[PDB]
Write a protein that binds this ligand. Sequence first.
Ligand code: GSH
Lengths: 14, 241
Amino acid sequence: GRCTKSIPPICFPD
Amino acid sequence: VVGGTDADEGEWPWQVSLHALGQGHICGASLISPNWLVSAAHCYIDDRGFRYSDPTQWTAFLGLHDQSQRSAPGVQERRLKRIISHPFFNDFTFDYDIALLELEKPAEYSSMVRPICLPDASHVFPAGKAIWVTGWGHTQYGGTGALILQKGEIRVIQQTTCENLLPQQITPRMMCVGFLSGGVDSCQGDSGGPLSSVEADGRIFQAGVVSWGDGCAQRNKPGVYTRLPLFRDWIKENTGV
Ligand SMILES: *SC[C@H](NC(=O)CC[C@H](N)C(=O)O)C(=O)NCC(=O)O
C-alpha cells in the first residue's frame, strides 16, 4: 500500500 | 493536505509549486536560497510516458497561492537548470528520498518569496513536537489537489512507533509525522514540500520533506517524510548553502 505523495504517485502492492 | 485549511496569502513564502509540461502542479519544493530548492527525488524519476528527470520539463512557481491564478502579483516563474537526486536514492524503498533543484534565474526575495531556515546536522526534532505540513496536494485520498495552498498541523512520531506502524518499511532516513488517528496528513501532490517547524525564536526551520505513505489520513498510517538534519552537510557540499 506504499505510495509516494506525487502526481502521478509511485505505488506498490504492499 | 487532508484535514487542513486555506493558508493566508504569503504565510508560507518558502513553499514552491513545481509544474511539468502540460501537467500543472505535480510536486512541491522549498526555497532555501536565491538559486536553490529542496524537493523529493521520486518526483523526477522517468516514467515510460514522460521524462521527469529532464530539467527543461519543469517550471517552478514561487510566491504562489492559487493554482488557478498563477499570474497573480508577486508570483515568480523560474526554469530549472539542474536536478541533483541523492546518490543513494532507492526508487523502490524510497530510501534517501531527497533532491536539490537549481534555478536558472535567481529568485527575487519579496513579502511572498522568502527562504526557509535549514536545521543543523546535529539538531533534533523531538517526538511530540508540533509541525506544519503544506501543499496543493489532495484534500482527501483519491481526490483532487487544492487550488488554494493548504496548511495542517501534525506531530513528530517516535521512531520505534513509526517502525511498528509500518513494519519493514522504515529506515533511519525516514520520519513519521502526523496523528495515529489520521484526520490530518499530507497526500498526493504534496511530495517534495517542506515540513515547517516553528522554533524557539519564532523562526521557521525545515523539519523534513514530504515523501510517501500508506494511503492518506488513515488510522495508524502516518505520513512518512525524509529527515533534514541528516542531509545538512550533503546540501552544503552540493549548493554552498
Ligand atoms: S533563515 C531563512 C529566512 N531568513 C530570512 O528571511 C532572512 C532575511 C533577512 N536576513 C532578515 O530578515 O534577517 C527565515 O527567516 N526563515 C524562516 C522565517 O520564519 O522567516
